[PDB]
Scaffold this active site. Structure first.
Site, short mmCIF file in Angstrom:
data_model
loop_
_atom_site.label_atom_id
_atom_site.label_comp_id
_atom_site.label_asym_id
_atom_site.label_seq_id
_atom_site.Cartn_x
_atom_site.Cartn_y
_atom_site.Cartn_z
N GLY A 1 0.81 -1.21 0.00
CA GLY A 1 0.00 0.00 0.00
C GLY A 1 0.84 1.25 0.00
CB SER A 2 0.21 4.54 1.59
OG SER A 2 -1.02 4.80 0.94
CB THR A 3 4.45 1.22 3.49
OG1 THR A 3 4.14 0.02 2.77
CG2 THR A 3 3.54 1.32 4.71
CB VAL A 4 5.97 0.89 -1.66
CG1 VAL A 4 6.43 -0.27 -0.79
CG2 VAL A 4 4.60 0.62 -2.24
CE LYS A 5 -0.27 6.61 -2.01
NZ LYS A 5 -0.80 5.24 -1.79
#
Length: 493
Positions: free
Chosen positions: A240-244
């Site tokens: 999810g957003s942790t690799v944005k």
């Protein structure tokens, strides 16, 4: 005949020398049945000290009276064996075996693993370094005289070679702290499972790797397989957003984007042909690059991804370790998955950019944030104590790394940021996320501290607290204690 002499299995310590797995000598008892058959009146006293039923013991000696050697019992305590030896029963002899003892118990159960009844490793470090830790067994020769009496002075044919010591990268002080606070976060939020990883971003050492639920390796008689899974290395999920932030690194390295560029996210949804990208915080009209991270805008990062193309994003993720083999050689370790298609349509580009088109482990996510925290320099993971700084690889330019580091600190400290994850007395950078899996919900936080000179990276996974920002306080408490434990001077006064 021949009787094996078990080898002293090597000691496992933490990075400082705290014992994590110790081979404790036990007493094993074996009998010469033909010699036992001449002292039947002593069998009841013998079976009592062995801890066996009188009649069952008698049946077993009779049915094996032909053999010159049987095992009465294996692995008695020292006092129990000395009770049997004190009976002075003809035909009863003892050998000293070893039973593995784990002093920290369930605190480091998944990292260390455990061993067989035959003292060979079956999980964790005990299996991954079993060659190193086992050593070679010895051979003792049973010598009988005339009339089949074993000679008291046993004859050793071949000596056992002891195993080798191993010091893990784990720090037992940080392991306790991480095991404790993670355990509280589950029983407080009513969560099913969880994981917590702490890395030294400069050395690649794994300072702590704890999972809930856990189990006591000294009491496996009622061990359930639900607690035995090393989730940090086996459970895969869409990050999810942790690799944005790694999509952002691709955008800043493309030369086409600066942090102050605004992106139109009106109205929090975006139509890509037949699919619909949705922001959770649809009450936003335009976001700059930092705000795209702060608000976890799927729409925002998708439009950036269309501009720079997915292969540049795939490259940053691949080079920080996502979906790649860690090289730790742990049993059951999963590599995850980075999607492989030559041509990148818009929907595949989008889902990869906001972290739904790939599968990673918590260990890989910590490794990726460690590279970002180490000024863009990737260092291999290690479960053993590194004899100081290994050679790293520059996968993100130091200036792009410094910029994304600054953005991630803004995720924690700026307006609308996750104030939960702030470490009082310290500047923390980090990014939250959420992973959903459908079969016919995990709270994620990943960060590092102190942001002025990062020392450690941390990933917190918390399984199913609802039917989700519950991991952020866990980061706060554990990161605070970890810095205060390994002595990091504050940077926020």
């Amino acid at each position: 005949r021949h009787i094996a002499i078990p080898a002293h299995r090597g000691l496992i310590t933490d990075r400082n020398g705290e014992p994590l797995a110790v081979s404790t000598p036990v007493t094993t008892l074996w009998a010469n049945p033909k010699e036992l058959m001449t002292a039947k009146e002593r069998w009841p006293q013998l079976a009592a000290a062995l801890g066996q039923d009188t009649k069952l013991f008698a049946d077993r000696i009779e049915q094996n009276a032909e053999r010159e050697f049987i095992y009465l019992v294996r692995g008695l305590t020292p006092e129990q064996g000395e009770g049997v030896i004190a009976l002075k029963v003809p035909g009863v002899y003892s050998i000293e075996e070893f039973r593995r003892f784990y002093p920290a118990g369930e605190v480091v159960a998944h990292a260390v693993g455990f061993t067989d009844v035959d003292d060979r490793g079956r999980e964790g470090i005990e299996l991954a370094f079993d060659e190193w830790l086992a050593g070679v067994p010895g051979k003792r020769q049973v010598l009988k005289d005339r009339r089949g009496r074993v000679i008291k002075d046993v004859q050793v044919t071949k000596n056992a070679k002891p195993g080798k010591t191993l010091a893990l990268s784990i720090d037992l002080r940080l392991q306790y702290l991480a095991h404790r606070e993670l355990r509280n976060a589950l029983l407080e939020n009513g969560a099913k499972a969880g994981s917590l990883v702490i890395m030294d971003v400069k050395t690649g050492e794994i300072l702590a790797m704890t999972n809930q639920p856990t189990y006591n390796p000294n009491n496996r008689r009622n061990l359930q397989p639900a607690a035995m899974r090393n989730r940090a290395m086996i459970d895969v999920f869409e990050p999810g957003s942790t690799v944005k932030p790694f999509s952002m690194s691709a955008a800043l390295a493309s030369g086409r984007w600066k942090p102050s560029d605004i992106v139109d996210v009106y109205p929090g949804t975006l139509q890509i042909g037949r699919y619909t990208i949705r922001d959770v915080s649809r009450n936003s009209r335009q976001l700059d690059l930092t705000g795209i991270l702060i608000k976890s805008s799927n729409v925002g990062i998708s439009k950036i991804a269309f501009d720079i193309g997915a292969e540049s994003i795939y490259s940053v993720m691949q080079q920080v370790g996502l979906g790649q083999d860690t090289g730790l050689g742990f049993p059951g370790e999963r590599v995850g998955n980075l999607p492989n298609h030559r041509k990148w349509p818009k929907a595949e580009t989008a889902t990869l950019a906001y972290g739904y088109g790939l599968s990673v482990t918590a260990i890989q996510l910590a490794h990726a944030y460690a590279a970002l925290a180490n000024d863009g320099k990737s260092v291999p993971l290690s479960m053993t104590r590194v004899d100081r700084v290994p050679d790293g690889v520059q996968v993100i330019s130091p200036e792009v790394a410094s910029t994304v580091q600054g953005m991630l600190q803004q995720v924690v400290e700026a307006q609308g940021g996750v104030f939960r994850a702030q470490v009082p007395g310290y500047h923390a950078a980090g990014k939250s996320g959420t992973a959903r899996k459908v079969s016919v919900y995990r709270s994620l936080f990943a960060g590092f501290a102190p942001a002025t000179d990062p020392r450690i990276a941390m990933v917190v996974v918390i399984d199913e607290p609802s039917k989700g920002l519950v991991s952020a306080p866990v980061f706060s408490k554990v990161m605070a204690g970890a810095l205060r434990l390994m002595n990091v001077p504050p940077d926020n006064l």
